[PDB]
Design an enzyme around this catalytic site. Structure first.
Site, mmCIF file in Angstrom:
data_model
loop_
_atom_site.group_PDB
_atom_site.id
_atom_site.type_symbol
_atom_site.label_atom_id
_atom_site.label_comp_id
_atom_site.label_asym_id
_atom_site.label_seq_id
_atom_site.Cartn_x
_atom_site.Cartn_y
_atom_site.Cartn_z
ATOM 1 C CB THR A 95 6.885 1.814 -22.309
ATOM 2 O OG1 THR A 95 7.184 0.853 -21.298
ATOM 3 C CG2 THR A 95 6.855 1.110 -23.655
ATOM 4 N N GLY B 287 -7.868 -8.479 -8.770
ATOM 5 C CA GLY B 287 -9.255 -8.593 -8.325
ATOM 6 C C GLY B 287 -10.387 -8.342 -9.312
ATOM 7 C CG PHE C 35 -13.538 -5.931 -5.204
ATOM 8 C CD1 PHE C 35 -12.676 -4.858 -5.387
ATOM 9 C CD2 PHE C 35 -13.053 -7.216 -5.426
ATOM 10 C CE1 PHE C 35 -11.354 -5.069 -5.752
ATOM 11 C CE2 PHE C 35 -11.736 -7.434 -5.799
ATOM 12 C CZ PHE C 35 -10.887 -6.357 -5.970
ATOM 13 C CD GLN D 120 -6.453 1.539 -1.918
ATOM 14 O OE1 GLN D 120 -6.507 0.623 -2.744
ATOM 15 N NE2 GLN D 120 -7.448 2.409 -1.746
ATOM 16 C CG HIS E 259 -4.830 -4.176 -0.903
ATOM 17 N ND1 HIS E 259 -4.860 -5.396 -0.268
ATOM 18 C CD2 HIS E 259 -5.774 -4.229 -1.869
ATOM 19 C CE1 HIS E 259 -5.784 -6.156 -0.825
ATOM 20 N NE2 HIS E 259 -6.356 -5.470 -1.798
ATOM 21 C CG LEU F 293 -2.823 -7.762 -4.091
ATOM 22 C CD1 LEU F 293 -3.276 -6.805 -2.992
ATOM 23 C CD2 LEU F 293 -3.422 -7.361 -5.430
ATOM 24 C CD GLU G 116 -11.039 -4.690 -1.159
ATOM 25 O OE1 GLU G 116 -11.635 -3.799 -1.828
ATOM 26 O OE2 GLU G 116 -10.235 -4.438 -0.227
ATOM 27 N NE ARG H 73 -8.284 -1.413 -2.117
ATOM 28 C CZ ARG H 73 -8.181 -2.147 -3.226
ATOM 29 N NH1 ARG H 73 -8.721 -3.358 -3.352
ATOM 30 N NH2 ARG H 73 -7.491 -1.643 -4.229
ATOM 31 C CG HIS I 163 -2.415 -1.773 -3.536
ATOM 32 N ND1 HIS I 163 -2.026 -2.949 -4.133
ATOM 33 C CD2 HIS I 163 -3.576 -1.410 -4.131
ATOM 34 C CE1 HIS I 163 -2.910 -3.282 -5.056
ATOM 35 N NE2 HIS I 163 -3.861 -2.364 -5.075
ATOM 36 N NE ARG J 204 -8.165 1.295 -6.945
ATOM 37 C CZ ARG J 204 -7.576 0.104 -6.952
ATOM 38 N NH1 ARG J 204 -6.337 -0.061 -6.487
ATOM 39 N NH2 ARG J 204 -8.239 -0.937 -7.430
ATOM 40 C CB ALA K 133 -12.702 -3.298 -9.184
HETATM 41 C C1 FAD Z 1 -0.715 -6.133 -7.184
HETATM 42 C C2 FAD Z 1 -1.725 -5.133 -7.696
HETATM 43 C C3 FAD Z 1 -3.019 -5.487 -8.000
HETATM 44 C C4 FAD Z 1 -3.906 -4.520 -8.467
HETATM 45 N N1 FAD Z 1 -5.143 -4.940 -8.757
HETATM 46 C C5 FAD Z 1 -6.056 -4.088 -9.205
HETATM 47 C C6 FAD Z 1 -7.398 -4.563 -9.500
HETATM 48 O O1 FAD Z 1 -7.602 -5.782 -9.326
HETATM 49 N N2 FAD Z 1 -8.303 -3.686 -9.948
HETATM 50 C C7 FAD Z 1 -7.982 -2.392 -10.137
HETATM 51 O O2 FAD Z 1 -8.826 -1.578 -10.571
HETATM 52 N N3 FAD Z 1 -6.751 -1.895 -9.879
HETATM 53 C C8 FAD Z 1 -5.763 -2.666 -9.408
HETATM 54 N N4 FAD Z 1 -4.483 -2.183 -9.105
HETATM 55 C C9 FAD Z 1 -4.212 -0.783 -9.384
HETATM 56 C C10 FAD Z 1 -4.007 -0.741 -10.915
HETATM 57 O O3 FAD Z 1 -3.550 -1.999 -11.446
HETATM 58 C C11 FAD Z 1 -2.975 0.274 -11.390
HETATM 59 O O4 FAD Z 1 -3.101 1.529 -10.712
HETATM 60 C C12 FAD Z 1 -3.155 0.492 -12.880
HETATM 61 O O5 FAD Z 1 -2.956 -0.769 -13.523
HETATM 62 C C13 FAD Z 1 -2.176 1.538 -13.384
HETATM 63 O O6 FAD Z 1 -2.014 1.472 -14.783
HETATM 64 P P1 FAD Z 1 -1.190 2.615 -15.543
HETATM 65 O O7 FAD Z 1 -1.257 2.386 -17.042
HETATM 66 O O8 FAD Z 1 -1.547 3.995 -14.972
HETATM 67 O O9 FAD Z 1 0.350 2.415 -15.090
HETATM 68 P P2 FAD Z 1 1.144 1.047 -15.005
HETATM 69 O O10 FAD Z 1 0.258 -0.116 -15.362
HETATM 70 O O11 FAD Z 1 1.896 1.017 -13.707
HETATM 71 O O12 FAD Z 1 2.257 1.238 -16.109
HETATM 72 C C14 FAD Z 1 3.069 2.388 -16.082
HETATM 73 C C15 FAD Z 1 3.774 2.462 -17.423
HETATM 74 O O13 FAD Z 1 4.546 3.653 -17.484
HETATM 75 C C16 FAD Z 1 5.854 3.355 -17.938
HETATM 76 N N5 FAD Z 1 6.880 4.237 -17.354
HETATM 77 C C17 FAD Z 1 7.022 4.573 -16.066
HETATM 78 N N6 FAD Z 1 8.096 5.387 -15.932
HETATM 79 C C18 FAD Z 1 8.632 5.565 -17.145
HETATM 80 C C19 FAD Z 1 9.760 6.299 -17.717
HETATM 81 N N7 FAD Z 1 10.582 7.029 -16.934
HETATM 82 N N8 FAD Z 1 9.962 6.225 -19.046
HETATM 83 C C20 FAD Z 1 9.164 5.506 -19.842
HETATM 84 N N9 FAD Z 1 8.119 4.813 -19.371
HETATM 85 C C21 FAD Z 1 7.821 4.809 -18.068
HETATM 86 C C22 FAD Z 1 6.091 1.928 -17.500
HETATM 87 O O14 FAD Z 1 7.170 1.357 -18.241
HETATM 88 C C23 FAD Z 1 4.725 1.318 -17.719
HETATM 89 O O15 FAD Z 1 4.529 0.964 -19.081
HETATM 90 C C24 FAD Z 1 -3.521 -3.099 -8.642
HETATM 91 C C25 FAD Z 1 -2.234 -2.737 -8.329
HETATM 92 C C26 FAD Z 1 -1.363 -3.712 -7.877
HETATM 93 C C27 FAD Z 1 0.002 -3.359 -7.519
#
Ligand code: FAD
Ligand code: EPH
Ligand code: HEM
Ligand code: UQ1
Ligand code: SF4
Ligand code: F3S
Ligand code: FES
Lengths: 616, 129, 250, 153
Positions: A42, A56, A124, A245, A247, A257, A260, A291, A358, A403, A406
């Site tokens: 990571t 949310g 939501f 999306q 938001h 953000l 919602e 959304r 978003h 999407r 939540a």
């Molecule tokens: C402000 C905000 C609020 C949100 N709230 C909600 C909510 O309330 N409910 C909901 O369901 N969803 C929500 N979402 C959407 C949701 O949080 C995310 O889509 C979800 O958390 C994505 O998780 P993930 O593990 O796929 O990637 P992320 O949590 O984005 O993490 C990505 C990981 O990949 C790693 N990575 C990326 N590129 C590289 C690289 N080149 N080399 C090594 N590592 C890398 C990063 O270091 C990180 O560890 C929200 C999004 C935002 C922005």
């Protein structure tokens, strides 16, 4: 490798997870406690991942607040997806949602609670009971205003007891491919400049989204789309990238953000002439519509001069009518963020907001087992041996064209877990860690070096800023055939300017000039593929709304009655997944289109949901 | 080129490994409890020694200050005299030196009580100036 | 123009015989966002691309951008620029941390110490994982407020002189409060064993009530109190209550 | 005998000294605040007193000089009363302070008054009472000496 010298270090793991947000950490847990030698790569410490910003909630039919059925949640997901979602995958999502969330609590996640001592749930946008017929659901399980933070800290801490081995602040460069199979990952170590090759039976991509391809978004600076760029560079086509999306309520000046959950708790939008305008745009679901819909209404109010404040260019989220006891127990995070970034006391005033980039329903395509796929007209879905993908970087596709709030933290855990389930089941001690091809990773280092020493006359920050502005202008909430086509010209030129790149910091140690220049390489791939797909899609579905093709184009016209019509053939309707195939050197993009999977996993458990006119 | 060498896992504290071969360090805290109660006990002692003087107070100030300053200096030693900064033997030395400090403090206090005006009177005489 | 000046600690390890320096940067306050982080990004992007620092969120939730600004440990992303243009604002890395480069400190002892407390839910009678929710009252989970909010940014630990002197032995305010967090969690069975891991004279007991941690915490939390609470528990002057019983319907 | 984390912690320090990395500045750059200044003062005073009882108890013990001759010596110098009462106020403050503030700290040890307004109030209270009690205990006998020197009977 041509100018400078690079120290290459080789590693050997059963499986290698790229990413440590919700999705990545969850895979890491299941695999860790199932005895596998698991590397987590990571580019930041896992707690910093974007999952941690999530506010949310996470969806599951617990029935803490009122009765509920996981099928009503499956329904709501599919309608949300505007029938571009794959129903096998949406089924698996929602079937498992209650187990996945309870697992979280059992892991120690400190959910807010009811008087009965069960997990508190709020309402939501986009959710209902009784297959659309009933009222607003309460399925969205929260830890106040910071559900993602709890979930990520719980998943991180719990990862600490399953003997995964963390490679932190390691920037992933490419998958290591060998005749169609993924055999691991090559990455740069920020601490000491070393280049690392990981040999692994399996590789999981769990890198998150590319929201940073736009000028204004709610995402982290680290949301650069490296993961989908990894797949592009590995010769894999991406899916549904035009579906972005917006938001409804990001903060106006700044992008931050506002959840919602604000609306779920009883907040509503208001325009300049004092109106709760969402009664006109969605009589039933009002400010809790989907959304895509809600952001549009908002965008029209601006265009038609109901926009609010000095420039009449945003609108107001109103909470001040709600009791402070509730604003404190249910929305402390945003109460504070509101104060810091907009100078707003939410008990007295409303928050200036505007739709904001978003999520990315787009990504690396996979079957329901989270295994990456390639697709030809003639051969169909062929898995990519060794390679899984999950979370936002993936396209399963549990979200299709819009999407549902939540469902993301949800999808990350459920298919994060699915990844480890599906590998314990199939990967067997028989098969041993693959040897690396000769020269494996050599092209990635060459690119690194080339970028590291980049001579040209356009600095990495300028080119990025113009990418982000081009994109905001041409591929926004409402798109149009010409604006899109002009947009694509300016974008493939920016891709050209890429060869005139300037970097400056020439170090290998913690050089973030270098990595942010890799991030611009990675973002551009995503951005170009996003816009060309958008330009070609002459329909309106979910987030993607064409002013010059305002109708949704399915294999039938589902406004009329079905029987009596003839099925339109694949090549004239748009109920189908976009696939973008890009040559990383030239930038040339080609398109194919892959059929939506309408059947569930098991008919005896649940019937699929044929398309209908989408209204809230 | 990738003609490279086999690498090792980075340094990482596996806290489940750590729980195989560790039996809790005998507690402190019992000692921390008496340290603090003692300090509380010394609260009335100081206003008393404003009023009542003489040789039997001089002994109570002496015992109570000695024993309190003992713990007091042990803390400051273990802060500024650390292995990382001093080397291991010199740090054990300043540790030992904290014991020298307590012992010499008492011997010097006992002497002064026993062959000079003593604590309470000594204060009177500077105050009388 | 309102030109603001910043003194920013530099260090470049790859240059030989290299020593830290201060570097002054001028920034047009009307070409720039209202937060310190904005200035850092501006400078990197226009003046000096070798300027190096961590960030990710934009809203003060990730904890990446922790550093020392105007003498205090805070987050650059939610720390307002002081617009008094005559004054220069000093920007150093978190105090007493080994530095990799510029404002980026080595953070792995801190993380290590985080793992040291076993920050995960422990249940003495093993439960089937997906099957049901553990009971917990409101007032019980409300004990976790002021605690679960910690973003692990390390501002507090890098403000504590006790930690400055004995990072290797004293666990520090950030980690101790998360130690406390898993201690007062009703659903957690291993309270006494968590305490047993930090019984000795250094781990929690090197806290000299300096109170810098609670003062500097950019999420307005109070580690100093959680430490007192560990000291009370650890000297047997209090005990953890027992789980309130789970109603037989539930 | 160290915990596993303390062993690891120690190997970290050597690893970092081996890497020849600088240490990010602290004392010389951290803003002075009424939190750590007062912990400063509490430690300075506590030590400055412990030290005085060592230099004195052993000083006058080991030396030929006795305390009575030392008092007469300084009286023989003919110092103004004000400066003498200042030297007296200066001897009192560390006893008043460290004593008062030491109960505040035992509060802190028991998770009491640890919030920021309390932290900051109890600081002034302690700081101000000490300045009071010391000025009280010095100006009182000197005021009631100037009485005896002119008080009718
Ligand atoms: C402000 C905000 C609020 C949100 N709230 C909600 C909510 O309330 N409910 C909901 O369901 N969803 C929500 N979402 C959407 C949701 O949080 C995310 O889509 C979800 O958390 C994505 O998780 P993930 O593990 O796929 O990637 P992320 O949590 O984005 O993490 C990505 C990981 O990949 C790693 N990575 C990326 N590129 C590289 C690289 N080149 N080399 C090594 N590592 C890398 C990063 O270091 C990180 O560890 C929200 C999004 C935002 C922005
Ligand atoms: C360089 C730094 C040097 C520092 C000094 C080092 C000495 C340390 C030891 C001090 C401890 C003993 C003090 C009391 C004492 O023995 O004599 C009283 C005398 C008076 O006799 P005197 O004036 O002759 O006697 C009275 C008149 N007959 O001396 C005093 O006046 C003591 C003043 C102390 C202030 C009062 C204590 C504050 C208490 C707070 C707690 C409150 C409530 C509980
Ligand atoms: C009269 C009432 C007194 C009380 C209630 C008291 C209380 C305390 C307490 C609670 C501490 C621990 C603070 C910490 O850990 O930083 C302490 C430390 C100390 N005390 Fe006292 N004390 C008193 C008087 C004295 C006196 C007269 C001396 C004279 C030499 C003294 C010397 C010290 C020293 C050297 C320390 C160690 C300071 C440090 O580690 O920072 N104390 N005291
Ligand atoms: C008593 O608390 C304090 C220390 O010890 C924990 C210090 O070392 C320091 C700084 C170092 C010295 C040697 C005074 C200060 C300022 C302080 O308040
Ligand atoms: S407590 Fe406040 S300061 Fe210490 S870590 Fe958690 S957040 Fe950063
Ligand atoms: S700053 Fe340090 S010593 Fe104690 S209360 Fe806070 S931890
Ligand atoms: S950028 Fe994450 S808290 Fe500053």
């Amino acid at each position: 490798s041509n100018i400078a010298q690079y120290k290459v270090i080789d590693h050997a793991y059963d499986v290698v997870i790229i990413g440590a947000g919700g999705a990545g950490l969850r895979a890491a847990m299941g695999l860790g406690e199932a005895g596998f030698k698991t590397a987590v790569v990571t580019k930041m410490f896992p707690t910093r991942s974007h999952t941690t910003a999530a506010q949310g909630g996470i969806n599951a039919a617990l029935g803490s607040m009122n009765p509920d059925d996981w099928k009503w949640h499956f329904y709501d997901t599919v309608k949300g997806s505007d029938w571009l979602g794959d129903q096998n995958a949406m089924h698996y999502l929602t079937r498992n949602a209650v187990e996945a969330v309870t697992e979280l609590e059992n892991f120690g996640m400190p959910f807010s609670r009811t008087p009965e001592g069960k997990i508190y749930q709020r309402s939501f946008g986009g959710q209902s009971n009784n297959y659309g017929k009933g009222g607003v659901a309460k399925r969205t399980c929260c830890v106040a205003d910071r559900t993602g933070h709890s979930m990520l800290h719980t998943l991180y801490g719990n990862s600490l007891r399953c003997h995964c081995t963390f490679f932190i602040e390691y920037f992933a460069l490419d998958l290591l491919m060998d005749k169609g199979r993924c055999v691991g990952v090559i990455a740069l170590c920020l601490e000491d400049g070393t280049i690392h090759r990981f040999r692994s039976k399996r590789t999981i991509v769990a890198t998150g989204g590319y929201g940073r391809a736009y000028f204004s978004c709610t995402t982290a600076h680290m949301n650069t789309g490296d993961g989908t760029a990894l797949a592009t560079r590995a010769g894999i086509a991406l899916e549904d990238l035009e579906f972005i999306q917006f938001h409804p309520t990001g903060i106006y000046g700044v992008g931050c953000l506002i959840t919602e959950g604000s609306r779920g708790e009883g907040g509503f939008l208001v325009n300049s002439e004092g109106e709760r305008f969402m009664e006109r745009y969605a009589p039933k679901a009002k400010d809790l519509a989907s959304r895509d819909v809600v952001s549009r209404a908002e965008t029209i109010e601006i265009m038609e001069g109901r926009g609010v404040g000095p420039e009449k260019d945003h609108i107001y989220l109103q909470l001040h009518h709600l009791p402070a006891e509730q604003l404190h127990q249910r929305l402390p995070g945003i109460s504070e963020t509101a104060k810091i970034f907009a100078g707003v006391d939410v008990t007295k005033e409303p928050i200036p907001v505007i739709p904001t980039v978003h999520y990315n329903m787009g990504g690396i395509p996979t079957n329901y087992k989270a295994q990456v796929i390639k697709y030809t007209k003639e051969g169909g879905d062929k898995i990519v041996p060794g390679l899984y993908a999950c979370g936002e970087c993936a396209c399963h596709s549990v979200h299709g064209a819009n999407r549902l709030g939540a469902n993301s933290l949800l999808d990350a855990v459920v298919f994060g877990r699915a990844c480890s389930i599906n590998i314990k089941e199939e990967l067997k001690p028989d098969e041993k860690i693959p040897e690396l091809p000769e020269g494996a990773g050599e092209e990635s280092i060459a690119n690194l070096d080339a970028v590291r020493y980049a001579n040209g006359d356009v600095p990495t920050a300028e080119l990025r800023l113009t990418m982000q502005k081009t994109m905001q202008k041409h591929a926004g909430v409402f798109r149009r055939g010409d604006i899109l086509a002009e947009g694509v010209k300016k974008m493939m030129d920016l891709f050209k300017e890429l060869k005139r790149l300037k970097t400056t910091d020439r170090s290998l140690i913690w050089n973030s000039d270098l990595t942010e220049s890799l991030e611009l390489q990675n973002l551009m791939l995503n951005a170009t593929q996003t816009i060309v797909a958008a330009e070609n899609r002459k329909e309106s579905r979910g987030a993607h709304a064409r002013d010059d093709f305002p109708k949704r184009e399915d294999e039938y016209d589902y406004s009329k009655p079905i029987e009596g019509q003839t099925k339109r053939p694949f090549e004239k309707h748009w109920r189908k997944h976009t696939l973008t195939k890009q040559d990383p050197r030239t930038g040339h993009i080609t398109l194919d289109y892959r059929p939506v999977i309408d059947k569930t996993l098991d008919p005896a458990e649940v019937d699929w949901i044929p398309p209908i006119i989408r209204s809230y | 080129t990738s003609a490279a060498v086999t690498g090792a896992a980075p340094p990482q504290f596996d806290p489940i490994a750590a729980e195989k071969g560790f039996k809790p360090l005998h507690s402190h805290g019992t000692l921390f409890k008496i340290e603090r109660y003692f300090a509380a006990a010394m609260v009335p002692l100081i206003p008393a020694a404003y009023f009542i003087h003489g040789r039997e107070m001089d002994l109570c100030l002496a015992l109570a200050l000695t024993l309190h300053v003992h713990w007091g200096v042990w803390g400051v030693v273990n802060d500024y005299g650390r292995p990382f900064v001093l080397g291991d033997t010199l740090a054990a030395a300043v540790r030992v030196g904290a014991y020298i400090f307590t012992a010499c403090l008492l011997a010097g206090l006992l002497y002064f009580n026993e062959h000079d005006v003593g604590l309470t009177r000594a204060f009177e005489m500077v105050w009388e100036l | 123009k309102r030109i603001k000046t910043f003194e920013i600690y530099r260090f470049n390890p790859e240059e030989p015989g290299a020593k830290p320096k201060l570097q002054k940067f001028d920034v047009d306050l009307d070409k720039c966002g209202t937060m310190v982080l904005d200035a850092l990004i501006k400078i990197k992007n226009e003046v000096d691309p070798t300027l190096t620092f961590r960030r990710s969120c934009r809203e003060g939730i990730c904890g990446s951008c922790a550093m020392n600004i105007a003498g205090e440990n805070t987050l650059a992303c939610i720390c307002n620029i002081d617009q008094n243009t005559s004054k220069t604002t000093k920007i150093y890395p978190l105090p007493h941390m080994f530095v990799i480069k510029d404002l980026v400190p080595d953070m792995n002892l801190f993380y290590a110490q985080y793992a040291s407390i076993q920050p995960w839910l422990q249940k003495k009678t093993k439960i089937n994982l997906g099957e049901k929710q553990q009971y917990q009252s409101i007032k019980e989970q409300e004990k976790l407020d002021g605690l679960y909010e910690c973003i692990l940014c390390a501002c507090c630990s890098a403000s504590c002189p006790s930690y400055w002197w004995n990072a290797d032995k004293y666990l520090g305010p950030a980690v101790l409060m998360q130690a406390y967090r898993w201690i007062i969690d009703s659903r957690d069975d291993s309270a006494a064993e968590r305490l047993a891991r930090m019984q000795d004279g250094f781990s929690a007991f090197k806290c000299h009530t300096i109170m810098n941690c609670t003062k500097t915490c950019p999420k307005h939390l109070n580690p100093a109190r959680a430490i007192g609470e560990i000291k009370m528990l650890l000297t047997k002057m209090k005990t953890k209550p027992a789980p309130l019983p789970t109603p037989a319907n539930f | 005998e160290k915990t596993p984390i303390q062993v690891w912690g120690w190997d970290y320090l050597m690893r970092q000294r081996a890497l020849k990395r600088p240490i990010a500045p602290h004392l010389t750059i951290y803003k002075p605040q009424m939190t750590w200044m007062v912990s400063g003062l509490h430690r300075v005073t506590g030590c400055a007193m412990a030290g005085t009882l060592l230099i004195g108890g052993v000083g006058f013990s080991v030396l030929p000089l006795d305390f009575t001759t030392f008092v007469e010596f300084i009286r023989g110098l003919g110092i103004p009363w004000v400066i003498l009462d200042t030297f007296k106020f200066i001897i009192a403050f560390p006893i008043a302070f460290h004593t008062l503030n030491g109960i505040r700290f035992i509060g802190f040890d028991m998770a009491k008054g640890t919030d920021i307004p309390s932290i900051y109030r109890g600081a002034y209270l302690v700081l101000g009472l000490a300045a009071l009690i010391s000025l009280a205990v010095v100006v009182y006998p000197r005021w009631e000496r100037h009485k005896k020197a002119t008080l009718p009977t």
